[PDB]
Every structure is written in C-alpha cells, then in structure tokens.
Amino acid sequence: HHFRFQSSDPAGNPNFELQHVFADKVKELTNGEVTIELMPVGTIVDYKETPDAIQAGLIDGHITDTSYFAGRDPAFGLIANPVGAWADPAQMIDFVENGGGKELMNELINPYGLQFIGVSTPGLEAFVSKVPLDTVEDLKGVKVRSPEGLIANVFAAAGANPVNLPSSEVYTSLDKGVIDAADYSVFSVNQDTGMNDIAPHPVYPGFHSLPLVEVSMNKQKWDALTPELQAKITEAQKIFQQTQIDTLHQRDLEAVEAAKAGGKITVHDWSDEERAKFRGIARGEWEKVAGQSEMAQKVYDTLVTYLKDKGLMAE
Ligand SMILES: [Zn+2]
Ligand SMILES: [Zn+2]
Ligand SMILES: [Zn+2]
Ligand SMILES: [Zn+2]
Ligand SMILES: [Zn+2]
Ligand SMILES: [Zn+2]
Ligand SMILES: [Zn+2]
Ligand SMILES: [Zn+2]
Ligand SMILES: [Zn+2]
Ligand SMILES: [Zn+2]
After folding, report:
1. What is the domain range of residue 199?
2. What is the 133 CA–ligand 8 centroid distance (Å)?
C-alpha cells in the first residue's frame, strides 16, 4: 500500500521535517508493506479542502490543523484548541487517547469519509509579558495581543484587553507600549525573536494555546487494512507524536536556560491552582461555543468531564 498524505506545513518547516518520522516509522514497522508519501501544504489541494480530497481519492490522508475546519462546525475550533485547558501536551494527548477525544474526532470526521488515526501538536505556546503575572488576577487591564475568536474572548473574560495585531507587529508594539503582553508562539520562538528580552516576564509553560494537529486518512482505505497493519500505523503515529513533543520540549528548555542565564528574565510557572482558575474562566467561553452546535456541546461535555475527573478544574 502506498498512501499520499498532505501536510499543513511547507517544506523547510521544522514540523514538516518532524512529520517524516510518521512516514519513516510506517515503512519500518510494516517492513515496507505500507509506505507514506508526505507532501507539503498545497501540493495537491488547498489546505482547507484536504478532507474532500481524501474521501475522493485524490490524496489518502493529511497531517493538519483541525482548527482549519471550524467553518464546518464550531466543534472543530473548540476541540482543536480549547483555550486554557492544557498546561502540557501530555494532558491533551491523554484526553484524546483515553478521555474521549479520539472518539469525538471520529464522530466529527467519519461523516467526511476520514478516519482519525492520532494526534500531534506544534506545541504548547509560552506567554510573552512585560509585566509580572503569577495569578489570573494579574491579567486584569493588561493589553494582550490576541488572535480573534476564542483566544481574545477568553482574555476578555479574564478582564484583559485584547488587541488585534499581525505577528510581524508584535515586537514593535510591545516596545512602543501598544501592548503589554502577547500570544505569540512556543518559548523557543519567543526567545529567538527577542520577545522575552523586551518583555522580561514570560509565562512558561504557557496556559492558553496548544493546537491539535490531526493525522487522519481515507476511512475506506483504513477499513480495508488488516488489524496488524492498522496497529502498526497507529504505532508509527504515536512515535511521530512523541518525537515531536520531545523535540519541542528540548528546544524550549534550551531557550529557557538561555533566558535565565542572562539574569534579567523571570520565567513564571503558574501554580496548578492558578491554572485551574484560568480553566474556570475559559470554561465560560467554551460554554458559549458549546451552545452553537450539537457536536460543540458534546466536545464541551467530554472535555469538562475529563478536566474535572483529572482534578484540573473545579468539580
Ligand atoms: Zn501577582
Ligand atoms: Zn499563538
Ligand atoms: Zn533558534
Ligand atoms: Zn536581547
Ligand atoms: Zn494489504
Ligand atoms: Zn521532554
Ligand atoms: Zn542546555
Ligand atoms: Zn509547572
Ligand atoms: Zn495562587
Ligand atoms: Zn478519572
């Protein structure tokens, strides 16, 4: 079997490169009986149309940002990045693999002719801040660069003042005082960009943005495989997932070490209690999204049940 998968990332991009692990491990684990051809974003079709292309047989799968499909159903946006839910990728991965998330993903994408194989992420983002934030209360009044939608709405619910800016304007806007803090990227990027130098109170691990990248394929083709090959492909995906998370973690740790060694940057790790408080604020916004569709309510119910059960949110 030879299956062509389209990525949401371009050639060159470090996450695209990490995705080679999925293809390589599928070939290794199946001793060649299944091969994956990994294609950069836009090779065969538009990044928002990969589901269509998969069910049609034009490509066989994708590795992509599930938030791209929020237009189909708000549930997609909510499950892809339930702002504030996670303090580490392991939490989200456990939610998917053992807490009902994978079943939700298949309920969402089987109707499009896709089988959800497994989850990955480009990383839990770190927060950029010029002002010292150790509690949720510290967010009140802070001008925070926030993407439109659930991220901005959660920061507003926390009493912050969201500001809408392109990524390329964040650095100068901090310097000029237009913003005091920002959503940007993972710590290693924030650090490399000089963000933490001009805004010397980052929060790491971050507390608000952890995007879900799905690995999914044509469900008819999936269903035609033997159990042992399905298990090997799921295994390959898990290996890719773990290699990606560990690689991201190491790069962040490198950057944090450099930040701390300079003696000026204070890296704040919010307590479990403060993170649980942030979940509670965010939950009010998740619930608004939950009311927008049946599947969004199901995502909300499953997520909140998981968080309460794990002691991550007030019972
Ligand atoms: Zn404080
Ligand atoms: Zn971000
Ligand atoms: Zn670097
Ligand atoms: Zn500097
Ligand atoms: Zn076969
Ligand atoms: Zn690690
Ligand atoms: Zn080091
Ligand atoms: Zn911690
Ligand atoms: Zn506290
Ligand atoms: Zn439990």
Report:
1. 1-315
2. 14
